[PDB]
């Protein structure tokens, strides 16, 4: 259902392995899986996320509804989605989702669970699941309003349109815009000056702006300055500093 | 006073219009009153599914800045002024269906702040925004200085009270103050337009992430994520997610 | 260390420079505590009704972040960081508005320093950065948590992580600097736009300042508690009438 590739050796490729169709409850706790062994993984040090293809990172906004059952049933699949977004963001290494085209729905939530994106310009992004009579589901609706705002969230879940990636630059969807073929390339370049950088500056960083963003400036200082003391009793500080 | 128009697709858009030209569509204190009857105090009936805000004469949306002078008596009355502002944007952004506030020319002082209630701003391209406030003594008493930080950012929102300019529209749309930019003579189709294209859509599952979108604004992720997770379990008890 | 000139119309706007030209304004120890001392520990003398802060050279801002003299004793850095945070703490809570005219190069400790400020006009040589990962190190002043307050987590992110260094024209596109203008005309646009400022009510700006430092903390409805309180006052003040 998945492919890993790691290569450096500190950099591997998690990509999406379902060109048939797109995110089910099965694909989902694979990314879970996935995700929890690099957690553990020290040989590892950014994390490339996009689809397998070349026309999708993920289209599961038109071409995947096990939505035929009861309103329990869609509390378990909202947290199966709750849960692989959730681990996908909090992983230990900094995560580029590289959209090579369609990022819909599920497949834009987790998308936007990822730390930075760089989409293909032939890329389309959105949260149209207004049109099947139910919000996002998976982390659109709090999400989404964190990354662009609130004016630019609610006018992509109201309307549930579609847009290029152009105009997903200019809202901050994304980070950069570079061309399909110049995905990955750049997608690499990006992750290779990331892998360069200190694993403990970096992953200590992340643990400070992942939850920093959840409380007022003066808590979040605090994890600044405790991330502050990690990275001293670490050698890296002391072996750079030169 | 006020002017409200039911008319769509089977009647499921509501354009409501400030009926104050003459004096540039200020907002007194009677404004915000009738306002908020008109949003019916955080409901309205089913059939609106859209609601369009917008001054009436295409001159201006409200441009209560330099037209209500009115702030000469008891600062102890000054509290149900900002009250009653606090209270008319508040009505305006808990509304039960989007709005969509069409700006037509000048929006200053509780006209800027009446504007950034709503959900989606389509500005025209003869439009002009700000908080003046800050010239007469006094900062945005209607949530100006909370709602337009929220939009924009601390850099634009703190540069725009401090200095308390006016921006033209192209330049609301670069900071994101307003969604789009259109020109005026063609603001209310495309007003209109996108209601359509909100109407469309199921309505429940709208006002359902507007509750979790509204509501998760003022909320770290974790409890955000708890209450999408439950209008989403909203909105498989009803037929619209199986048809 | 520093350099504190007072004039304007209606003699309100205080210039404050950072005096190290020959190592590029560096941030240590000795100019921290002095900065917090011309801030006044978050208040000012009555002159005053604008200050503006920038680097002396017109090259360098602060170019605090690549200083790196503190490789020792993890724990005599809790101090640093929390000499660090007492700057910000101070620039940022200070009555008046700050108006940072970066001139050239601002990083790290330089760069978080004018994320303190409420408005940045920077310039074509104005060119931004955390480097400190790069070091080894999280930043550790503010930077994790001001810097997403500003640009959003998402280029917050790709900023950090990187620790790379962003032209002007950039910094202007994601938030993080207010206003460009070109080198020759950096102080005139500060000095004019202080000016405007300073022409307003004295008491409306600075109570606006509170409403919006303490309200960007907390939710709405408190938010609105904070600027309601402030409004009141100022009806009380004569500034309101007149």
């Known amino acids: 259902?998945?492919?890993?590739?790691?290569?450096?050796?500190?950099?591997?490729?998690?990509?999406?392995?379902?060109?048939?169709?797109?995110?089910?409850?099965?694909?989902?706790?694979?990314?879970?899986?996935?995700?929890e062994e690099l957690n553990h993984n020290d040989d590892v040090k950014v994390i490339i996320l996009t689809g397998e293809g070349e026309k999708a990172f993920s289209a599961?906004?038109?071409?995947?509804?096990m939505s035929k059952i009861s309103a329990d049933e869609s509390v378990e699949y909202?947290?199966?989605?709750?849960?692989?977004?959730?681990?996908?963001?909090?992983?230990?290494?900094?995560?580029?989702?590289?959209?090579?085209?369609?990022?819909?729905?599920?497949?834009?939530?987790?998308?936007?669970?990822?730390?930075?994106?760089?989409?293909?310009?032939?890329?389309?992004?959105?949260?149209?699941?207004?049109?099947?009579?139910v919000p996002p589901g998976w982390g659109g609706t709090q999400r989404l309003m964190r990354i662009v705002g609130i004016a630019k969230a609610k006018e992509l879940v109201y309307t549930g349109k579609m847009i290029k990636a152009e105009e997903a630059k200019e809202?901050?969807?994304?980070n950069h815009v570079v061309p399909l073929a110049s995905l990955q390339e750049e997608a690499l370049k990006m992750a290779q000056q990331i892998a360069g950088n200190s694993t403990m500056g970096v992953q200590m960083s992340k643990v400070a702006i992942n939850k920093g963003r959840n409380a007022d400036?003066?808590?979040?200082?605090?994890?600044?300055?405790?991330?502050?003391?990690?990275?001293?009793?670490?050698?890296?500080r002391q072996e750079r500093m030169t």
């Open 60 to 65: 599961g906004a038109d071409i995947e509804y």
């Open 171 to 174: 809202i901050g969807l994304v």
């Open 78 to 133: 909202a947290k199966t989605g709750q849960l692989v977004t959730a681990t996908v963001e909090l992983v230990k290494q900094p995560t580029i989702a590289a959209v090579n085209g369609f990022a819909l729905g599920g497949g834009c939530e987790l998308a936007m669970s990822c730390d930075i994106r760089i989409a293909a310009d032939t890329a389309k992004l959105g949260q149209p699941e207004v049109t099947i009579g």
């Open 1 to 35: 259902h998945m492919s890993l590739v790691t290569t450096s050796d500190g950099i591997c490729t998690v990509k999406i392995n379902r060109p048939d169709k797109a995110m089910n409850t099965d694909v989902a706790k694979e990314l879970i899986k996935t995700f």
């Open 217 to 236: 400036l003066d808590t979040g200082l605090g994890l600044e300055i405790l991330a502050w003391r990690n990275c001293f009793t670490h050698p890296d």
